[PDB]
């Protein structure tokens, strides 16, 4: 089942213009429950898929920005979901899981940050 | 979400050995309902994928063979899904469509095969 990522502000995950194509950014943008807003989780295999152009949240090369592109069972492409008992989950890059899904400081574009528990790097998977 | 795959016999689609690894056989057993006789399928995507391993029916590069191997976003892990109105489904491989999910002479393997309407290249997915 499909799945929204949900800023402290409430503000969510976003496949930015909805697009369907490989590379295209992860922002934070206004929730208004299209279906570039909604992804599937598979805690087995770790990955995050747009419903959208089912494609995966992958983590570019410089192991900062994220994108999304066609899924190839990368490192890159697999998280582990670490919950905290206030509801929260702690989203970690399994090629380096100090490195977690965060926010840029404009709080407009989701990004890879190491792990402090700043408030944006703890998701509401809803 | 889990689904079974049946042939006209009545026995499934199974992941020999119930194995996690690459390269596993997909065969024909009689049906136990363990995970390895199950699988998802997202057609928009178009793969399916062993619940009990989460990796996906490829065709090998022999165009015969089907095995499970790590999702890569082949067209020999994707899949068109052609509906009968008798309730069957025909499972043509995406890189060559004339090409179909069908069962070896002893009805003992999954392979593919060009489609005639061969009473097993008719699967029920249930």
């Known amino acids: 089942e499909a799945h929204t990522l949900v800023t402290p502000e409430g503000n969510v995950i976003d496949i930015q213009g909805a697009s369907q194509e490989n590379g295209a950014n992860a922002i934070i943008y206004p929730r208004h429950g299209g ?3 909604l992804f599937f989780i598979d805690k087995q295999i770790g ?3 747009s419903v959208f152009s089912r494609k995966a949240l992958t983590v570019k090369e410089n192991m900062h920005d994220i994108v999304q592109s066609d899924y190839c069972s ?3 492409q697999q998280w582990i979901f670490e ?3 206030d509801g929260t989950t702690i989203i970690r890059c399994y090629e380096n899981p100090e490195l ?3 926010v840029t400081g404009n709080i407009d ?3 890879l940050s190491p792990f402090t528990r700043e408030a944006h790097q703890l998701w509401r998977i809803e």
Chains 1, 2 share one sequence.
Do not use: A
């Open 47 to 49: 990955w995050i898929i």
């Open 35 to 37: 279906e570039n807003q």
């Open 109 to 111: 574009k989701v990004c």
């Open 100 to 102: 977690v899904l965060s």
């Open 83 to 85: 919950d905290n008992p």
């Open 74 to 76: 990368l490192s890159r």
